[model samples]
Target chain A: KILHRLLQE
Target chain B: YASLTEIEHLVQSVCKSYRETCQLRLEDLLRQRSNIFSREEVTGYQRKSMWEMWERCAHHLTEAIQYVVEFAKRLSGFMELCQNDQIVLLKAGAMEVVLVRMCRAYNADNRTVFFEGKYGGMELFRALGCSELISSIFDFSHSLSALHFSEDEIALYTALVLINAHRPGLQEKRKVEQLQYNLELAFHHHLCKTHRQSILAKLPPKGKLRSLCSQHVERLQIFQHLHPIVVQAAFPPLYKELFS
Candidate 1:
């Protein structure tokens, strides 16, 4: 879940 | 160059040392510095390692970076014309991104590895820490950038160009730099028409990517490549100033 935000620009 | 003392100072630009002073300061910085490690030798990025290991990585870059900053300070016609505040501001933002990117050039495409000065961490080293995003971003950007195989002179050109473009904080001289920026683009097109090295030159990157690359170029982790500067202070006093 946290990975998603971090990856998003 | 003629010094124009003040038309009244911006709050932020005030209370700073002169560029001439920055030179002697740079001389002090170069005296006590560290170098980078090779890829296989890299220890994994762990929690505290951002400040710990990454600080070393950042240290490896300081010499090349200091050279670029001092080089640009002298060589950029547009940069030379900017006010002291613009010059200092460029050092902050421009060099940050360029140094980071140039670090990418040390990647060994054959091994799928890259080094900081020569230091590198494997993908597994990063994944052990659950940092898929940062590690991927690091490799992805470095891999794409190094693919162009830009010669060192080309790297220097864009780095100087980006230095010209340091987040224009209403530099009244901003338009003048922009004029030269386009002139720089014109010069590149002419170079492309005349040179054998194809597909690389021509794009004048300021924010995203362009190379009339003068030499300098970035990375990361949950291993916390973030703690880089936080680790240093008065330790190597001049480099401490240069690092920030």
Candidate 2:
């Protein structure tokens, strides 16, 4: 499972 | 092995090279033990098996080195960022985010286990307080940079208390205090200015509740002084919380 995604521009 | 290479003279090599020669031996052993055997099987199979083992070892070593090097580089960058006092607020905020993310990633599975249970929330609130203080330092960063009519510094200090309590990284205490001190200096500047806008932002009482919750949660892992002690070490801000 994808727990979290990094914020990216 | 260059500049001091070993010469492989067959006569002198017999005993010492025995272990090194295991690749050759193992291949022969495997061929002898196989269901289908060839009459004139060369030692090629043994050499192939040895080569495969060496290749796997080399790949694994390379990967391990790469991870160590990247971790070292990130740590060095963090240290460099902290040393520049003028950017401490921004630097500290960024670092707190980075560390919280690291802890969360490292502790994810454990979070389901017994100790896993306690670890996740500690990191979670750490993320939150870190976020709030970002709101404070945002009052500092010109990236969302702007000119303010009043002392934004006191507001920055109050926010810092919340950030400090939940700061997860062990290495950040000194830099955190430095940022706190800078906020206090700004607070004093606001007090002298007597700006109502600045004064209203200094409402520490409301902020204290949230900051205290974080501080208590963090104390489960860390036994350091309360956030107020760290905040008191800062120079006082000049603004009144209710003046506006």
Candidate 3:
């Protein structure tokens, strides 16, 4: 979940 | 099996080394903030605007990141990890550790955190336009402050957060698990000796930190959308990279 990516759950 | 004295000795050395290398001393950081605030002439005070707030907070975040980086290098088995895995661990855990460490700097009596040069209540950060996120940090700090963790415990806990074998993208999960195991042993032994073993239940689980960091990023995105130019110009590049 690429922790910092803002828009994806 | 390692004898009790053997465990004590190992834990003692860990404590000594962590004390020597820890850069985020509460007394020092508070004094620095006090000194910076002392320079300001306060006839009548107005709240700092959002841009100013983000700039100062981001500056502090950058400094925290540097400390986290140095601390990571000091961990016993951290250096042996593959470079990519090392980077992955840092990226995943530094802010979580920073947030944990923030409890030390927080003024629980006032429900405030050290920002810019003052210990400010949540209203001081109202300009950020992310009250939910701001208060969550405040609440997190408040709950964590209740634990009253000693320096050694905090340091070992910080290492535990960093060396998590479960963080996504780790190439050597078992190796990271081994390092984390050693850290957990030191932490458990130190707590037993210090009579703080009960704090284990009070500690935030990994999911809590994950949720907080995500909220932080979400807030950052909102701020960036509202003031793209200010964010680009005022925030540290590393802070932006990590949070944005």
In terms of DockQ, which candidate is strongest?
3
Candidate 3: segments with Cα more than 4 A from true spot: A1-9, B1-6, B29-47
Q: What are the per-residue Cα lDDT tens digits for candidate 3 across B1-244?
A: 1667766765776666566666556677657543323223221123567777777778888787777776776665887888778879988898998888888878766676766566666666666677888788899999888887777787778778888999899999899987787778878988888889899988987588888889988888888998999888889877876777
Q: Calculate the i-RMS of every candidate, to one decimal place.
A: 17.3, 16.7, 10.0
TM-score of each: 0.50, 0.23, 0.84
Per residue, candidate 1 scores C-alpha lDDT tens digits across B93-148 of 44443444443343443323334323343442452333443354454456445545
- Please identify which of the two predictions, 2 or 3, would achieve the higher lDDT against the true structure: 3
What's the distance in Å from true for residue B216, model 3?
0.4
Q: Per-residue lDDT of B94-189 in model 2, one digit per residue for the tens? A: 322221212112212222101111212222222223334323322223211122222133123323332342344435667556544443444444
Model 1 chain B lowest lDDT segment of ten: B6-15
Candidate 2 chain B lDDT trough over 10 residues, lowest sum: B235-244
Docking class of 2: incorrect
Candidate 2 all-Cα RMSD: 27.9
Q: Report per-candidate DockQ.
A: 0.02, 0.02, 0.04
Q: For all candidates, what are the clash counts?
A: 23, 8, 0
Clash count (model 3, backbone only): 0
